[PDB]
């Protein structure tokens, strides 16, 4: 937040009083314009509803990359100068899909080709089915 | 960028952007690149 004189404050934009914005629904925003932790944000919905006061212009800060995680923590402090501040930590798990890159301690970085089943992974004489098969070559 | 537009025109000469003749027949006999093999002659090599 920076007051300057066009200044801006944390708030909640109603759709038909603030200017240009997408169809990012403002359900998740609270009474003052911050998301409380424990509210699952989807791809591209408003997390901080900041408005340069002009009628007013619109300066939302979208969730980039459309990851669909969970907002985990919000702190509200002052800056160096005396202006209110906020940091937000949107967490997401990431299950290892096809693609995510693995490597041992012995060079030879590799991908993940296909994910088989315990059903299908070749079993030993004693019911061991290895987690990972690397190429001989 | 040296051979950016050296082509084979319908004379089967070898011509380019500045429309000058590079070669009169393409590759010294007109034959094409990817339809030849290695063969031997057997009149050159043996004795008299």
């Amino acid at each position: 937040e920076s007051k300057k004189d066009q200044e801006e404050v944390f708030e909640k934009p109603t759709r038909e009083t603030c200017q240009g914005m997408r169809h990012a629904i403002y359900d998740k925003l609270d009474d003052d314009g911050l998301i409380a932790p424990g509210v699952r944000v989807s791809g591209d919905d408003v997390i901080i509803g900041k408005t340069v006061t002009l009628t007013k212009r619109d300066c939302s800060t979208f969730l980039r990359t459309s990851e669909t995680g969970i907002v985990d923590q919000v702190m509200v402090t002052l800056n160096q100068e005396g202006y209110k501040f906020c940091k937000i930590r949107v967490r997401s798990v990431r299950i290892p899909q096809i693609g995510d890159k693995f490597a041992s301690r012995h060079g030879q970085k590799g991908t993940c080709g296909i994910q088989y089943r315990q059903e299908d992974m070749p079993f030993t004489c004693e019911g061991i089915t290895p987690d990972i098969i690397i190429n001989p070559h | 960028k040296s051979m950016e537009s050296v082509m084979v025109k319908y004379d089967a000469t070898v011509r380019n952007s500045i429309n000058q003749v590079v070669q009169l027949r393409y590759g010294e006999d007109g034959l094409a690149g990817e339809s030849v093999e290695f063969q031997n002659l057997a009149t050159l090599k043996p004795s008299n």
Binding site: - | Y10, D11, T13
Partner: protein
């Protein structure tokens, strides 16, 4: 008559690339697989205009020519 009596592979890209275009645009049939059959049965209403590097040209039709 100094041009080659066959069809070069660049004509066949531009014959069938355009003959299938007009058949897509509501023409009389004589889209891509339609024009493959017409060339290999030799029924196409296109005359190829081959220039020469002097400035001249020679106008060939497909039935005058040996297709691949």
């Amino acid at each position: 008559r100094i041009t080659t009596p066959y069809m070069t592979k660049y004509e066949r890209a531009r014959v069938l690339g355009t003959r299938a275009l007009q058949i897509a645009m509501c023409a009389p049939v004589m889209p891509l697989l339609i024009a493959m059959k017409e060339l290999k049965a030799r029924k196409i209403p296109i005359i190829i205009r081959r220039y020469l590097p002097d400035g001249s040209y020679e106008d060939w039709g497909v039935d005058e020519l040996i297709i691949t």
